[PDB]
Amino acid sequence: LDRADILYNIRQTSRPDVIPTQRDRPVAVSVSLKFINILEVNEITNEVDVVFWQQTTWSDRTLAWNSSHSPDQVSVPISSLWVPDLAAYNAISKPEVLTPQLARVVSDGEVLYMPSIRQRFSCDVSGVDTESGATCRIKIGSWTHHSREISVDPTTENDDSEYFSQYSRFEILDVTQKKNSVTYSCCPEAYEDVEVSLNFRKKG
Amino acid sequence: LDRADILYNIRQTSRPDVIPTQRDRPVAVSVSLKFINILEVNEITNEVDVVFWQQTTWSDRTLAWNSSHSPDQVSVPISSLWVPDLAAYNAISKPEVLTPQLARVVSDGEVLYMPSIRQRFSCDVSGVDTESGATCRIKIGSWTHHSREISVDPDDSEYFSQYSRFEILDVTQKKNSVTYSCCPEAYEDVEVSLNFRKK
């Protein structure tokens, strides 16, 4: 197969509005935020303006192809693919996507989408001027799907891992990612989110 | 062939979502920034707001046609063509494209795309008020393709606005190849260094 053939087959077969279940197991989505910059902070309003890479991965087995004598990956517009309906429960602005809206599709059906996003959040921010710093929490989960359709897990988990600017007014003390599972007595299914905690302070 | 025929063949042949690699070999993209204006600078936040023409070129030999008795070039909407998925790694705003989204296709398959872009960057900023000035670096490369798929390679003030608060001391454009422990392939960018100061 050449790249053109692969892209043709991906366009046929991929249903962008259908979760790619495979054998009624949930689609396993992994997500991680990598912070690139913290632009505006407001102690008064508790608003923070952040730029981050949203490392997102999942599998869609129906996209898979045999990769001997063929390319092992391709780049594909996300309008050709199902992408998870993730949202930050505490965002106060629409996410501005800064980068080309392409994902990487691996011949085994894995999808890797890493948009750079600029977004405002409502967040603690109080001790930004202190040695201990402020911590902003961002809660991310599927807006419409529960755990039997989509599972959401933090990717196997890193810090200021050489993503963060250096020209920013702030420094990153620590980023941590934990998972939550909310269950209600009505229903057997669970509602999953990832809580991302950004501990940062002003330099100086 | 007339212009309509050429545009028809280009649409049939160009696949806008397929990189036009010819055999195993990468599409050679060349890119260069011409600065038109620097609008806002912030020494406190290290943010700069800049307008530039992004001169971009590459070849897609499958687009080629015989140009005796025919036009030697045509203008083509970019939605009819593959264009490289270039991005400024250190942008903090989405690129505002100011111009009509058309490229020039030459009868040999060469493509020329030169959008005027306005965009904000995270940038050093210090010494903008000094003789030596500040230097802002802009890093541009493919967002999703490595060096086996796309390679990225590279006067001054000739189009720089006379009403700007700043003046350009020097622009330099150097190439990088980033390599990672997973993979034998490299990620290529052009690092553009804009040395400017207040007048």
Partner: peptide, 30 residues
């Protein structure tokens, strides 16, 4: 020259980078 995590850099003037899936890397001139 530079060691960037598990990576030894191919030339001089290289800086370090980490991608979350590709690993430690060297950003090199030329």
């Amino acid at each position: 020259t530079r060691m960037c995590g598990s990576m030894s850099c191919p030339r001089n003037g290289c800086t370090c980078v980490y991608h979350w899936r590709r690993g430690h890397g060297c950003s090199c001139p030329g």
